[PDB]
Amino acid sequence: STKVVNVAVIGAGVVGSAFLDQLLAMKSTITYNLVLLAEAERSLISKDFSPLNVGSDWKAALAASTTKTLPLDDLIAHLKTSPKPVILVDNTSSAYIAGFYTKFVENGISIATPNKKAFSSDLATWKALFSNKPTNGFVYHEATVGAGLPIISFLREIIQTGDEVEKIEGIFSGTLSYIFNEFSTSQANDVKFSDVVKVAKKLGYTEPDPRDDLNGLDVARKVTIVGRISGVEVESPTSFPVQSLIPKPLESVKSADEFLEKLSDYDKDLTQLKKEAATENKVLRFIGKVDVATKSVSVGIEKYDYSHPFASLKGSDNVISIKTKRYTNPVVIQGAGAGAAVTAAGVLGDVIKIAQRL
Amino acid sequence: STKVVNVAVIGAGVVGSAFLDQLLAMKSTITYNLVLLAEAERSLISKDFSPLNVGSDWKAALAASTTKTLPLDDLIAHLKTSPKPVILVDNTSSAYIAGFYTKFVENGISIATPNKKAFSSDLATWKALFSNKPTNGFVYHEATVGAGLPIISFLREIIQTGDEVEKIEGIFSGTLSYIFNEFSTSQANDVKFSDVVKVAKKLGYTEPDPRDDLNGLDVARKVTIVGRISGVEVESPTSFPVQSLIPKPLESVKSADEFLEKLSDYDKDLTQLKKEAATENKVLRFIGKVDVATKSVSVGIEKYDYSHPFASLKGSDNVISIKTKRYTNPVVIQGAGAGAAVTAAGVLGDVIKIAQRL
Ligand SMILES: NC(=O)c1ccc[n+]([C@@H]2O[C@H](COP(=O)([O-])OP(=O)(O)OC[C@H]3O[C@@H](n4cnc5c(N)ncnc54)[C@H](O)[C@@H]3O)[C@@H](O)[C@H]2O)c1
Numbered sequence: 001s002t003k004v005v006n007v008a009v010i011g012a013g014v015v016g017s018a019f020l021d022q023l024l025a026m027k028s029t030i031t032y033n034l035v036l037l038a039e040a041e042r043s044l045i046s047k048d049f050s051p052l053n054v055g056s057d058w059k060a061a062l063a064a065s066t067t068k069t070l071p072l073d074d075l076i077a078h079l080k081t082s083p084k085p086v087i088l089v090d091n092t093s094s095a096y097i098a099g100f101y102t103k104f105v106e107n108g109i110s111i112a113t114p115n116k117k118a119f120s121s122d123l124a125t126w127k128a129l130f131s132n133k134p135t136n137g138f139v140y141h142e143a144t145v146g147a148g149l150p151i152i153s154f155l156r157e158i159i160q161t162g163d164e165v166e167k168i169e170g171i172f173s174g175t176l177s178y179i180f181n182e183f184s185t186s187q188a189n190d191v192k193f194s195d196v197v198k199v200a201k202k203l204g205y206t207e208p209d210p211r212d213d214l215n216g217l218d219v220a221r222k223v224t225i226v227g228r229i230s231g232v233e234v235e236s237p238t239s240f241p242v243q244s245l246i247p248k249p250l251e252s253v254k255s256a257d258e259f260l261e262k263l264s265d266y267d268k269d270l271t272q273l274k275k276e277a278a279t280e281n282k283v284l285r286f287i288g289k290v291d292v293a294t295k296s297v298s299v300g301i302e303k304y305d306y307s308h309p310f311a312s313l314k315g316s317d318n319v320i321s322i323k324t325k326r327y328t329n330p331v332v333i334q335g336a337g338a339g340a341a342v343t344a345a346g347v348l349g350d351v352i353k354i355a356q357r358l
Numbered sequence: 359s360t361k362v363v364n365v366a367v368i369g370a371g372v373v374g375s376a377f378l379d380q381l382l383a384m385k386s387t388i389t390y391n392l393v394l395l396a397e398a399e400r401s402l403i404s405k406d407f408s409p410l411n412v413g414s415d416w417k418a419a420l421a422a423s424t425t426k427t428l429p430l431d432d433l434i435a436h437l438k439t440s441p442k443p444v445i446l447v448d449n450t451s452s453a454y455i456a457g458f459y460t461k462f463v464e465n466g467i468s469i470a471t472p473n474k475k476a477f478s479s480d481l482a483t484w485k486a487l488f489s490n491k492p493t494n495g496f497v498y499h500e501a502t503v504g505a506g507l508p509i510i511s512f513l514r515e516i517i518q519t520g521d522e523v524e525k526i527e528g529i530f531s532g533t534l535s536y537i538f539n540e541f542s543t544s545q546a547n548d549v550k551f552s553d554v555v556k557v558a559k560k561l562g563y564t565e566p567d568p569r570d571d572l573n574g575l576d577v578a579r580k581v582t583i584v585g586r587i588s589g590v591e592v593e594s595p596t597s598f599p600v601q602s603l604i605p606k607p608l609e610s611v612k613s614a615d616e617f618l619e620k621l622s623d624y625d626k627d628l629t630q631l632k633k634e635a636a637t638e639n640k641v642l643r644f645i646g647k648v649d650v651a652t653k654s655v656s657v658g659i660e661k662y663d664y665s666h667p668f669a670s671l672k673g674s675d676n677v678i679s680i681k682t683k684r685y686t687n688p689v690v691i692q693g694a695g696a697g698a699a700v701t702a703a704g705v706l707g708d709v710i711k712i713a714q715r716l
């Protein structure tokens with residue numbers, strides 16, 4: 001519905017710029033007018049709400065802008081006056097922006113985003129975002145868990161029709177999936193955890209500092225989200241057991257490059273844990289888990305039989321196994337769970353779901 | 359104020375019945391009014407367009423009605439009269455009703471359905487899926503391929519995003535998935551093809567006459583749908599290779615129930631193939647296949663290694679493997695692809711998409 005929608009983009013980084021390219025080249029019966037292109041420093045803004053005149057080369061326009069990005073209270077005071085429904089696309093991982101979601105929604109502005117923040121913080125924030133009071137903006141966050149795979153929309157659809165989630169488990173980290181798919185295979189191999197890690201870092205399958213992947217916070221925020229969708233009132237990303245791969249108190253002691261070279265000093269444990277699993281004919285994988293019956297959520301290493309689909313993941317795919325009252329046999333979804341184009345497409349897909357809803 | 363959508367249902371069988379229950383139970387910010395229900399010669403029609411007063415038990419109310427079922431032309435006329443957008447839900451498998459789809463849509467009546475007829479006939483009939491006219495209802499057929507799994511919506515989504523499907527292949531028949539799951543397994547099986555069908559027949563996991571499942575026509579039906587969505591203009595479900603499982607030229611004979619009793623005479627070929635695959639650590643599966651580059655579509659048996667996702671299916675499960683420009687590694691979606699509840703949930707899932715879009 002509404003043949004004309006205004007899109008307000010925040011974020012022009014790795015995911016953000018692919019998103020912009022996809023949004024600006026998309027052909028549809030619905031007209032999507034870009035009215036904001038904000039970055040940390042500069043920002044493009046249509047005071048008019050008419051489409052920003054950038055053709056398909058927004059980078060030169062943005063680079064040439066000396067207008068400072070508006071503080072969110074100012075941005076909303078402006079966007080709320082749009083003559084057509086507005087959709088905020090938050091392509092950042094900003095706590096600051098996330099902190100403003102509720103005010104966006106309350107001002108009738110919808111949100112499409114991969115930012116996990118607002119969905120993995122306060123439990124009241126969460127409820128406020130999905131209240132759907134009249135005229136308030138709709139909030140879509142498909143890309144928060146599983147990038148562009150059809151996961152969250154599928155869960156929400158299912159729950160709406162009356163189905164009930166009972167158990168979920170999955171590998172929601174592309175970096176950790178890669179590491180384990182390499183570190184623990186069916187074939188017995190004496191590969192060290194430290195070697196795989198720094199190898200992953202060199203190939204670039206890691207955040208600049210691998211510790212931002214090994215701590216499990218990323219996977220913990222995603223399970224917080226999936227758990228709450230499943231009806232488990234998870235308090236926070238740290239209110240349940242989250243097994244960190246960062247070697248014990250030798251953690252918040254080091255500093256980047258130090259951590260890496262210092263890591264090899266612990267391959268002992270994982271080598272022996274992997275061995276015991278190779279005894280029980282299982283492999284090690286890093287998972288996120290939800291159990292609604294027991295209202296128990298968790299993150300960490302778990303063993304999986306060689307037959308299990310988790311042991312045959314290709315590359316660094318993500319996977320979610322979903323058991324509900326109706327799907328007694330698991331619904332299993334695999335595929336890239338990260339990557340610029342695929343993640344931006346999931347966000348774009350969310351923009352399309354909102355555009356038809358408005 | 360509250361958005362309202364009137365729902366008109368045709369068919370209260372295994373699926374429709376689950377659909378109706380789910381519909382009357384669902385709680386949403388949008389109000390769905392059941393304004394018409396038709397099953398065989400009995401219909402419940404709210405001449406008022408107010409929600410049918412089915413009290414608690416809609417079955418008892420349907421059975422009590424003395425209102426005859428309206429010819430389709432009179433049904434359309436009546437529906438055009440509704441004060442609110444109407445969504446027709448065809449829970450039949452009728453090629454006759456299917457034949458009236460165009461009339462419904464060009465008259466502003468939307469459609470949600472598990473009925474594959476209209477989508478798997480000739481190509482020109484399929485082309486009539488785009489709102490050539492601005493007063494055209496929508497057409498959703500999610501449950502036509504893979505029950506309630508997120509397949510068709512996912513395919514259409516990424517395509518809109520700019521992605522391009524290159525290859526697809528999956529198990530699309532619940533019955534045939536069940537049969538091959540019993541017949542060809544990883545753990546040294548030994549059952550006769552003959553026996554797998556006879557039992558699937560008694561449990562009612564196959565059409566009253568399993569030949570309608572073995573001729574492979576149904577998967578060809580769903581392949582025609584997927585292939586079209588993928589940009590391959592499949593002429594019809596019989597314009598491409600389809601491997602039939604009804605024993606050689608010894609099908610166009612039997613009086614039907616005769617078939618089952620004479621089937622045990624040909625378990626040889628498949629028993630051989632079965633053994634061979636096992637010898638190779640592979641399993642046998644009946645699949646559908648589409649290749650967009652070569653515009654090649656087909657269905658039939660294929661072998662898969664024990665660790666392959668197509669070897670992890672349970673009972674009536676089915677799967678689809680999608681390789682796209684962005685997903686070099688396929689995203690694989692699996693789970694129940696048949697069954698009252700899950701299918702009805704797929705249809706209601708579409709009813710909800712349409713309602714939000716209206
Ligand atoms: N990189 C991946 O593979 C991947 C996979 C899934 C999800 N994500 C998520 O996608 C989002 C985008 O990540 P990314 O890789 O593009 O990060 P990035 O750092 O490359 O881009 C972030 C952008 O946000 C801008 N920004 C930050 N704070 C801002 C503010 N207050 N106002 C305006 N602009 C602001 C930055 O200037 C930058 O252009 C994050 O939420 C990330 O967690 C990333």
Ligand code: NA
Nearest residue numbers: 142146147149
């Ligand atoms: Na996702």
Ligand code: NA
Nearest residue numbers: 500503504505
């Ligand atoms: Na489906």
